[PDB]
Symmetry: D2
């Protein structure tokens, strides 16, 4: 069912900011595991769905509840990493080039400059006290205003919050290259952020 | 699909410990709402399941994640209240009579007496800092040992933790009769706890 | 130390929207309990602080961690209810009158109208799946933009999120008058919301 | 105030199960950061404590709430790693040798064998969906019974739950040696678990 997104650039294309070693593992092992976990969980839910249709018991309801956590976690892992690769690009393909259009105007109006929004995001990233993510979002419920939000583990942004830029703060995203020095990774990644994709997502809503 | 459990005793059967006013609302309004919410959520998941089979996209995955919370919450609300009514009984039907069999021996071995286990549970109930539950459980993974656990909101005990006695700590469970005096409710409810059902659940596993 | 905020209007001043019965209990019992809980927790932390200065052991650190939850919960309970009473007023004192100044302009720019912001807040309130709050906030980090956020239990808005209007979604806030019909309470409360105070808080930041 | 626990064995003493590279970083960088974070947070709380004594305002309460998270996280990080090093030992110092005394009897009575308890713990470790820990605990409230519990991030076991064996499941605990293969790390670590210390902690309570 759900599959790994097609490889766009080779693993080493984001060097020296993110290593090919990291990208190979992050994609072939970590992302694949969420793919497999999500497929398994949705399958298990379908089986329990049919079981509940036959006997709508509290005991059968309890096993549905047990599987929900795996749908959330692996579903989140699948979606978050898909977003992640799509908002990353080598400098040859426009990575690190500033956003354009309505997103660029919103950034300047709200934060004063790109650098200020980046600074805020880096603060949110360093403030993840465990595994998680930061997302630059467009909030559709308050007039399409920009904000930066943290999530933990593989929690994601849903509903009115549209993800524009996803940044992985899990230790596996940086440890082989940066080790404990996560701030250096958060600083470095903006050199390969695909702001064209972010602008596109701002417009698409 | 999922329906309200058949009424066993009339609403006023647990008086003076829990009022008929409370029981009517708790069953006909609160429990029914979880029933409806659970049916709606499982339906919505089935629709999204079919949508993912057609297009296994990250966008479609995100809406599956959004619905998971409602399955957990309403599923939990459905199951928890089912457990709740089944471990309650009027004194005429054996409510408040101490447990028997293997459960009775386990209680005495682990806690020294029924009163000590009740005291512990009441501490856990008063320690719920918001809406939630306390469960006296049998843990199947550590040799079938008794413990008391808290959950928040409509979170429940799954997997190796077998619920033996569920006690509702949501304010709607007591407010009309006891108001802020939750400790008086926690004290009073043991007069109508169905320990025969608890003993049965200990044995069934 | 921390004390209950001085009574401003009498308990029945918000009728028929919130009953005097509710307000008496909410203030004299619920709010007071958070006051007492917060004083106790900060005292206990001071004692443990001195103990750590004498012996900075992992065992002493563990008891500090245990007390943190009570500081958060009771501290939150104290602050949230203080905010709550201060953004409520009888219609005779301007309750239910629309906001003015920069807040009024921000509301119209972002949400189109007051009614739309209220609708959004009511959705967030009904979406609290347990005990909690909704807050209309000013976000100081994204250009002072308005948003509506949920918290659970006695969690609060800190740092860059400035609370403008706090609405209590705990069942004790409505149950005696509305019972299960929380939507009717969420609808009714806006008739006594102090939008002058909200405008003041928007400006003060 | 709080300091890094004195080094007992050299960084490479747990090889080939945990690398010296990992241990150097885990101790000198990760543990030190929690030490610094905990000292800073307790200092900040003392300053806010004095500020509240002067003005017990809701605004001052809000900043106390903000700092609580850092006390919990860094306090937990400090305590958890202290526990971690103390339940690890080279094979030359008794690492990997089975527990003795009352703990050994409890393990056999509850789980059937050491291998079964290890299997359960490894399941709990692999089930940490993010950063966290597994703890083999003695529960003082249910008759001193053994259990295995998960925590997330730097959350810890407090009160009646006595930590006997702490196992770090944060990716930084294994990534440089095992990368994504966390199950291999969970399997390998038992060769250097200090079960003598675990037996001692079981007895001390
Ligand atoms: Mn990742
Ligand atoms: Mn209930
Ligand atoms: Mn309240
Ligand atoms: Mn660690």
């Amino acid at each position: 069912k759900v599959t790994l997104p097609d490889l766009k650039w080779d693993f080493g294309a984001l060097e020296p900011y993110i290593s090919g070693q990291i990208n190979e593992l992050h994609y072939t092992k970590h992302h694949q595991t969420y793919v497999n976990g999500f497929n398994t969980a949705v399958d298990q839910f379908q089986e329990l769905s049919d079981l509940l249709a036959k006997e709508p018991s509290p005991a059968n309801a309890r096993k549905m509840i047990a599987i929900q956590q795996n749908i959330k976690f692996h579903g989140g892992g699948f979606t978050n990493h898909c977003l992640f690769w799509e908002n990353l690009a080598p400098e040859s393909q426009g990575g690190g080039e500033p956003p354009t259009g309505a997103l660029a105007k919103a950034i300047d109006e709200q934060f004063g400059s790109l650098d200020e929004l980046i600074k805020l995001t880096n603060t949110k990233l360093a403030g993840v006290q465990g595994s998680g993510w930061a997302f630059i979002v467009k909030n559709l419920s308050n007039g399409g205003k920009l904000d930066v939000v943290q999530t933990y583990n593989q929690d994601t942004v849903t509903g009115p919050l549209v993800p524009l830029v996803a940044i992985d703060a899990w230790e596996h995203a940086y440890y082989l290259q940066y080790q404990n020095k996560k701030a250096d990774y958060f600083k470095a990644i903006w050199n390969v952020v695909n702001w064209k994709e972010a602008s596109r997502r701002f417009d698409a809503g």
